Paper text:
ATP synthases use a transmembrane electrochemical proton motive force (pmf) to generate adenosine triphosphate (ATP) from adenosine diphosphate (ADP) and inorganic phosphate (Pi). ATP synthases are macromolecular machines consisting of an ATP-hydrolysis-driven F1 motor and a proton-translocation-driven FO motor. The F1 and FO motors oppose each other’s action on a shared rotor subcomplex and are held stationary relative to each other by a peripheral stalk. In Saccharomyces cerevisiae, the FO region contains subunits a, e, f, g, i/j, k, 8, part of subunit b, and the c10-ring of the rotor, while the F1 region includes a trimer of catalytic subunit αβ pairs and subunits γ, δ, and ε from the rotor.
We purified S. cerevisiae ATP synthase with the detergent n-Dodecyl-β-D-Maltopyranoside (DDM), which results in a monomeric preparation of the enzyme, and determined its structure by cryoEM. Three-dimensional (3D) classification allowed particle images to be separated into six rotor positions, corresponding to the catalytic and binding dwells for each of the three main rotational states. These conformations resemble recent catalytic and binding dwell structures for an isolated bacterial F1 subcomplex imaged during ATP hydrolysis, where the absence of the peripheral stalk resulted in all catalytic dwell structures being identical and all binding dwell structures being identical. For yeast ATP synthase imaged without ATP, the catalytic dwell structures show αβtight either in the open conformation lacking nucleotide or in a closed conformation with weak nucleotide density, and the binding dwell structures show αβtight only in an open conformation without nucleotide. The existence of αβtight in an open conformation without visible nucleotide density is likely an artifact from loss of ATP during the purification of the enzyme.
Author numbering:
A (entry chain F): 8 to 475
B (entry chain C): 27 to 509
C (entry chain G): 224 to 276
D (entry chain B): 27 to 407, 412 to 509
E (entry chain A): 256 to 383
């Protein structure tokens, strides 16, 4: 077989010299024997003089120049099919649940072409999440692409777990969860919750496949695990013909990972230090996620926002790839208004009068008009206070404050640390409640009665409890 | 190795080729694996090829052959109703393209002499645009604004509006639309094509798509080949409207290519000649003289600002190149003003010459009232007392602002715009409750179309309000306001 | 009595307005210093990348 | 030249060496002058050594020799009561280190399956933290704030409190403490060691010091070697707590290394992988399953913000990595509200699983009360109920004040939080609340010691215990 | 000027203006491919203006008796006093004569902003 010698090691990058002039094609997997077992490297460039530059999928520590490298003859390839359901898979496709080999009859490369233009299929069906702000102001689309945006410590993870809990059971198809550079603790928490609620069943049929490249991993692994998740999801979409949920947390960690290796690969840094290839790398990854005429993929993605800067090239470029967006904000979180969704920046394709009907569209647009007026009056309220506002501006500010607090909602997942019982609200109930609030029917209710409740019925009940 | 070379190195979409002594700059080459490339860099011992595909196919030692061809694209009326990639290959899944010819991508713009002054309107059907920032045929009107503000909505309404004339017989009015999708995801283009086909606007449109996954050179090269496609109509006495959605993503693609070729970076790491890029692209939009068949090509560049920062490199470049701007803002969007055009920042430098005479006549004072309103609103917000005239200014300006609201995919003919702007500007709306303006419009048109159809017919066919038409319009407005 | 109360209340209202505006000045001075440092750093990074091409 | 090399060049803390053919990546090498280094770059025909020391000690042409070891440090229980540098050399002057073994500085954090849910308390003895921001064993809780706001005070009181159990006989309750001073003044670390020795907390603590003057690589390395030291306790079924003071200064040292290696500066001129620096460090804090021996390693990273900006780059990174945050506010600290916890921004996602059941009972629905009190203050900036809320919130906040080096056991916290939430403090003037606690506890120790012992032993308030606490509280409050 | 200073005479020197000298020095340094600093100025521009301005001196009787008085001119874009080179020179010199555009266009000329203008030698030099 084709064999080579390691000539250079820097960080995650390794250069291999092949005296056999038939070099491995780019993206080929190469294997080094180590006390850990095999270390897998991915060919990234051809440098000339029979030298290829490659990215290590695990720690390069312990490598020695002159160490032998074997060419596998193909890209990194992962198990596919129903044998992956109910199991946790590593970036290079090995199981890490300690339950032995994955016995899939097929194994597929993680690098593949996106579906052609002719294969695209488009639809406008609402995915009811049970979350007031999302269902009202930014409805999710079945078979569409969904993105949570948010800085550190605003609740991306709790929101993702709430979406999983609400949607996985109702979906009924298959599911894939890909942890890309996120907390290992929460990987374990998700695993045990899924195993207790029966969606994972070690003694029987399971409906979710797990892939994890969590944040402890070297950048080489984090830059590729998302493609393994995509490969399993695509096998469900195209070959099984099923309907697939594909959760990714956190897709920004993919882009960031490339940046970490970008300098070592010899590229000139782009703005704020990102790799030149950011836009095309992220396109090549993300536009594989599309639904097609063969099947539907409903993908929910968490996107990190460095330093809360939504203008950062990675979130900014990610915005172009989504049908629905939910921008979590620290400014909202500091008010204690969980789930901290920004009701003005959050935006969705499906908030269209032809999709949601005229009543829902009117309620949402009036809500956003009220909130925008209240935000426009912030400086005046801060400096002069409420008294000097026009009287209808006073009324609008009161209703805007009540709408703000009414958009908060306690998730069952957060009950562990909020102590507020989980609550779920249907779409029609949400629309009716906010129409009632806009129409002034509940102007006499104190605003704290709106905080952390679900539905206007709970608002009136909490008004009773506050009156007692 | 005069007409052939061999790859020295390859990666990240760039190949370095030894030999190819006789290759021309920007010439196409074919690798033995079948992938194609474009020779951007000629150097004393190397050629820098940018690949139109996955570099998995190319490898060191790969043989490379000259094509002897600069980039060219098929052109002609056979592309109407088709979706094509950056090189003119059909991607809609239908049959081949019946090209009338082929045209290079990089082409010299028409000089000083061939052109003629812009004097024909591009009727967008948007009240705000047609009333306050007119677009003329041969103009280059920038559409600029933050993400998800309505840029594509404005361009798409402009495309949809042309169905009034594209079904007619007069070839001098018909405007053929080219839409260039750069960096967009293929599903967005699919939704766009279903929107066009649902409204039956596709039969006179062309889509050039260089989506997110397509190699950086194609995203770079799509606007130029789309311009070459549009230029056939210009050069054969017809009229074309080309929408570049979005040029910022093309600039990003060129930054990728230039950085990977190791060309010296500039501000924000953009290459030193990106202004040359957008300028040599946009100067091709022109209005030609009778000696050249009087054709035209109109450009609507789309630019996505980040956080409203217009001081950025590319925004400033394109703002300084184009003939004006349509500024979209999120604040206006959430206040309920759709298409959310900031009429204070928006400017058309071709100006009233591009405006239908009737709408010029009635819209004259609209700009003044809106400027005064924007100046005065600070008094109301600041809690200060209001003089009588300032209160009148507010009552007028709020209703004019309400009157420019418009639903998506619902463009208005100028016979329908003129009565509304007339009624608003003359103060006949001042008594109506601010909530009911939308009810007024829908009713008032329904009234005029039923009981005053002669006015609409004459406004359309003449395009100008004679004194008799204006007096009759006054009488009709007073009649209906006395509902 | 109403006139006296009005003038006293306006005194106190303008006092509160000035104090609130001073707090906002402190906040925006902090934000300005942060933006100053960020702008300098970004421009210098652009220059350094240009040099080290 | 296989096992030795010669320095080609020296500069900016980097030594380019010729030879060392058989060297392993990140191997520890020794220079002729005794200074050591890490072989970070393996390149064709040369190696780049990062120097764990001043480059004055290295000259061109000097011999460099392999060690055969990836950078590693001694570990074991013999380090208890010792101060060591970033590489485990003793600096307290008390003699050699009795290592139970050696462990690499950087190690893969335990994966998803080895771990367990966090379900035991790290008793800080601070009323505010134990009540509102529970910290669990295996949690990794950020302490973040402006300079001189009590960050080290919070960590140090948490360390001191463990004396209640580390003197006992049950290792299921003991918690051994590791503390890294990174970039801190050496005099400050000396005085901190003195403070621990005064309170007898030294005999179970370990201090790993990379003070301000020491070469940047040592400041970069110290957190990893201290994590390795704590991982010995983690892996052997013992419980450890590791404090990083600060991680920000580690990030600064890493930025120094990365820019002197001439790697591209990113946001705020930090290198692109500054995230990975803290992520691979903090993921090592874990709670292990019964199959893995049930040990744990709790982490308390300390972050210094400028002007209170939690939105900065490094603060947001660490907030992304950690399980929560304790935000220490300068504005509260100036007004004498110490430990100065900002209860609005402070959160512990582990939450109830880490809390003692009795505190979960009495402190139930208290987290909401104080943020509601802050909102009431904003609204005033009155309704009768809002006046009552203001009166109770002020006095609850007075209960949350606490003097330094004075941690309270939960048996002492529970009566106070009970009296607060149940409104008994509402009749006592604020100035006397500090006396109330001291008297109130003194009464329960004097006349109701059985109640306190029951609270300690059972960990929960049954109906009988809750009613007895009510009766004693009322009896004292009336008295 | 130092010839008059050294030989027992008094000299006044007006640098009109130092901003453009700094610009020219930046041009030289960048075209010599020396490492840039803040705002692309060289790494030692402060050592340009200090090297220049500390030659203005008042000599003791043992060194003869001579003075060189420097009035550097600085042009602040948009009136920004916090710019780099102005920040350097303002610290370099013994005071400021600050000219405000608003006063100049009000017709108050020479338009000296008395609030910002200061002489740190001050009253010691003033005529009694
Ligand atoms: N006139 C309008 N009335 C109502 N909604 C509108 C109008 N114009 C646009 N929208 C809505 O605004 C949202 C964004 O529209 P659009 O896609 O045209 O924006 P864009 O600025 O081109 O966005 P992007 O940068 O994401 O491509 C969509 O929900 C669209 O339905
Ligand atoms: N609860 C408290 N009561 C009284 N004084 C306190 C309290 N907590 C801290 N202090 C005092 O506040 C000052 C700062 O404390 P400390 O050194 O812990 O802060 P820090 O945030 O770690 O500071 P730095 O950024 O300088 O390291 C010291 O005088 C300490 O004694
Ligand atoms: Mg768009
Ligand atoms: Mg401290």
């Amino acid at each position: 077989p084709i064999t080579g010698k390691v000539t250079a090691v820097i960080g995650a990058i390794v250069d291999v010299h092949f005296e056999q002039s038939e070099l491995p094609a780019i993206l080929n997997a190469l294997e080094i024997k180590t006390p850990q077992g095999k270390l897998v490297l991915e060919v990234a460039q051809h440098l000339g003089e029979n030298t290829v530059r490659t990215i290590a999928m695990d720690g390069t520590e312990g490598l020695v120049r002159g160490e032998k490298v074997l060419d596998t003859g193909g890209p990194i390839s992962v198990p596919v099919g129903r044998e992956t359901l109910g199991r946790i898979i590593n970036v290079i496709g090995e199981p890490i649940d300690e339950r032995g080999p994955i016995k899939s009859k097929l194994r597929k490369p993680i690098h593949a072409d996106p579906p052609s233009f002719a294969e695209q299929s488009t639809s406008a069906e609402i995915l009811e999440t049970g979350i007031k702000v999302v269902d009202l102001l930014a409805p999710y689309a079945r078979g569409g692409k969904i993105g949570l945006f948010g800085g550190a410590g605003v609740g991306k993870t709790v929101f993702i777990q709430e979406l999983i809990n609400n949607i996985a059971k109702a979906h009924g198809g298959f599911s894939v969860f890909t942890g890309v550079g996120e907390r290992t603790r929460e990987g374990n928490d998700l695993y045990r919750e899924m195993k207790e609620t029966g969606v994972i069943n070690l003694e029987g049929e399971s409906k979710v496949a797990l892939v994890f490249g969590q944040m402890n991993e070297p950048p080489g692994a984090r830059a590729r695990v998302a493609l393994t998740g995509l490969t399993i999801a695509e096998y469900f979409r195209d070959e099984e013909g099923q309907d697939v949920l594909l959760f990714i947390d956190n897709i920004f960690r993919f882009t960031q990972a490339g940046s970490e290796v970008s300098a070592l690969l010899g590229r000139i840094p782009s703005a704020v230090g990102y790799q030149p290839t950011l836009a095309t790398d992220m396109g090549l990854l993300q536009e594989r996620i599309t639904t097609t005429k063969k099947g539907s993929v409903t993908s929910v993605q968490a996107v990190y926002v460095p330093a809360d800067d939504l203008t950062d090239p990675a979130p900014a470029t990610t915005f172009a790839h989504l049908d629905a967006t939910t921008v979590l904000s620290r400014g909202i979180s500091e008010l204690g208004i969980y789930p901290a969704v920004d009701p003005l920046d959050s935006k969705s394709r499906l908030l269209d009068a032809a999709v949601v009907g005229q009543e829902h569209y009117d309620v949402a647009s009036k809500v956003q008009e009220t909130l925008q007026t209240y935000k426009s009056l912030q400086d005046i309220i801060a400096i002069l206070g409420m008294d000097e506002l026009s009287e209808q501006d006073k009324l609008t500010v009161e209703r805007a404050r009540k709408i703000q607090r009414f958009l908060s909602q306690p998730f069952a997942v957060a009950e562990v640390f909020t102590g507020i019982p989980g609550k779920l609200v249907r779409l029609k109930d949400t629309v009716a409640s906010f129409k009632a609030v806009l129409e002034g029917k509940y102007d006499n209710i104190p605003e704290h009665a709106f905080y952390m409740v679900g539905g206007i019925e709970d608002v009136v009940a909490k008004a009773e409890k506050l009156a007692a | 190795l005069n007409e052939t070379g061999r790859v020295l190195a390859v990666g990240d979409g760039i190949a370095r080729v030894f030999g190819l002594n006789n290759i021309q700059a920007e010439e196409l080459v074919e690798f033995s694996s079948g992938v194609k490339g474009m020779a951007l860099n000629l150097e004393p011992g190397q050629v820098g090829i940018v690949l139109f595909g996955s570099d998995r196919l190319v490898k060191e030692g790969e043989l490379v052959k000259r094509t002897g061809n600069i980039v060219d694209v098929p052109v002609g009326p056979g592309l109407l109703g088709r979706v094509v990639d950056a090189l003119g290959n059909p991607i809609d899944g239908k049959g081949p393209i019946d090209a009338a010819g082929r045209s290079r991508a990089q082409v010299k713009a028409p000089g000083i002499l061939p052109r003629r002054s812009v004097h024909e309107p591009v009727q967008t059907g948007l009240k705000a645009v047609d009333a306050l920032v007119p677009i003329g045929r041969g103009q280059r009107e920038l559409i600029i604004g933050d993400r998800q503000t309505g840029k594509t909505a404005v361009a798409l309404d402009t495309i949809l509006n042309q169905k009034r004339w594209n079904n007619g017989s007069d070839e001098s009015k018909k405007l053929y639309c080219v839409y260039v999708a750069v960096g967009q995801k293929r599903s967005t283009v699919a939704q766009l094509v279903q929107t066009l086909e649902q409204h039956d606007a596709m039969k006179y449109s062309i889509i050039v798509a260089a989506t997110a996954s397509e190699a950086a050179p194609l995203q770079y090269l799509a606007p130029f080949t789309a311009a070459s496609i549009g230029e056939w109509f210009r050069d054969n006495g017809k009229h074309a409207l080309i929408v570049y959605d979005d040029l910022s993503k093309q600039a990003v693609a060129y930054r990728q290519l230039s950085l990977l070729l190791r060309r010296p970076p500039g501000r924000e790491a953009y290459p030193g000649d990106v202004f040359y890029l957008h300028s040599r692209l946009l100067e091709r939009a022109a209005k030609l003289s009778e000696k050249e068949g009087s054709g035209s090509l109109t450009a609507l560049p789309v630019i996505e600002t980040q956080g409203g920062d217009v001081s950025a490199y590319i925004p400033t470049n394109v703002i300084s190149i184009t003939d004006g701007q349509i500024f979209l803002e999120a604040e206006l969007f959430y206040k309920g003003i759709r298409p959310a055009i900031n009429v204070g920042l928006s400017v058309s430098r071709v100006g009233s010459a591009a405006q239908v005479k009737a709408l010029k006549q009635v819209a004259g004072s609209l700009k003044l009232f809106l400027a005064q309103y924007r100046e005065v609103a600070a008094f109301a917000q600041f809690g200060s007392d209001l003089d009588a005239s300032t209160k009148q200014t507010l009552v007028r300006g709020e209703r004019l602002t309400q009157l420019l609201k418009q639903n998506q995919y619902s463009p208005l003919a100028t016979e329908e715009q003129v009565p509304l702007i007339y009624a608003g500007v003359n103060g006949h709306l001042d008594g109506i409750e601010l909530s009911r303006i939308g009810e007024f419009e829908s009713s008032f048109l329904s009234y005029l179309k039923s009981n005053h159809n002669e006015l609409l017919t004459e406004i359309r066919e003449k395009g100008e309000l004679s004194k008799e038409l204006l007096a009759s319009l006054k009488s009709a407005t007073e009649s209906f306001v006395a509902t | 009595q109403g006139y006296a109360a009005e003038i006293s209340a306006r005194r106190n209202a303008m006092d509160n307005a000035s104090k609130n505006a001073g707090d906002m000045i402190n906040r925006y001075s902090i934000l300005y210093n942060r933006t100053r440092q960020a702008v300098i750093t970004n421009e210098l990074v652009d220059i350094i990348t240009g040099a080290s091409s």
